[PDB]
A paper describes a structure:
CoV-N protein is a multifunctional protein that plays a crucial role in the viral life cycle. The N protein comprises the N-terminal domain (N-NTD) and the C-terminal domain (N-CTD), sandwiched by three intrinsically disordered regions (IDRs), namely the N-terminal arm (N-arm), the central linker region (LKR) containing the Ser/Arg (SR)-rich motif, and the C-terminal tail (C-tail). In particular, the N protein interacts with Nsp3 to facilitate viral replication and infectivity. The coronavirus nucleocapsid (N) protein interacts with non-structural protein 3 (Nsp3) to facilitate viral RNA synthesis and stabilization.
Arg92, Arg95, and Arg107 of the NTD β-hairpin comprise the positively charged center. Particularly, Arg92, Arg95, and Arg107 are also potential nucleic acid-binding sites of NTD in SARS-CoV-231. The SARS-CoV-2 NTD has been identified to possess an overlapping region between RNA- and Ubl1-binding site, suggesting that Ubl1 and RNA could affect each other for N protein binding.
Author numbering: 47 to 174
Write the structure that this text describes.
Amino acid sequence: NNTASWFTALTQHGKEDLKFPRGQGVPINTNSSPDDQIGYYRRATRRIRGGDGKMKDLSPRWYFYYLGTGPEAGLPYGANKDGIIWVATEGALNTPKDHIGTRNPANNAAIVLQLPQGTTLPKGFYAE
């Protein structure tokens, strides 16, 4: 607890897991350096009780954590895990980003997720 993504989420409207072409997907953060531009998005599921007394699955959200941080801080880049997808800018260093760490919501609001010009969000994904 008291740990969160530095950024706002991507929402999934389709059936396919989030996926970026190699070199794309790392949110913009002016307080970070070129070496730091690598990590993962982790799926967060939500469901609520409908009018019919059955659980309704809402659109999955995906949140970015820098490599070596967050709920999967221990996973190396490329590790295969459901709900985890990897992104990296060319020339980012494969080193943990402990100097960036995660966000404490008591101290800092999320950075608005923004992707560098020319980036393609996959079908059905939107930055809310």
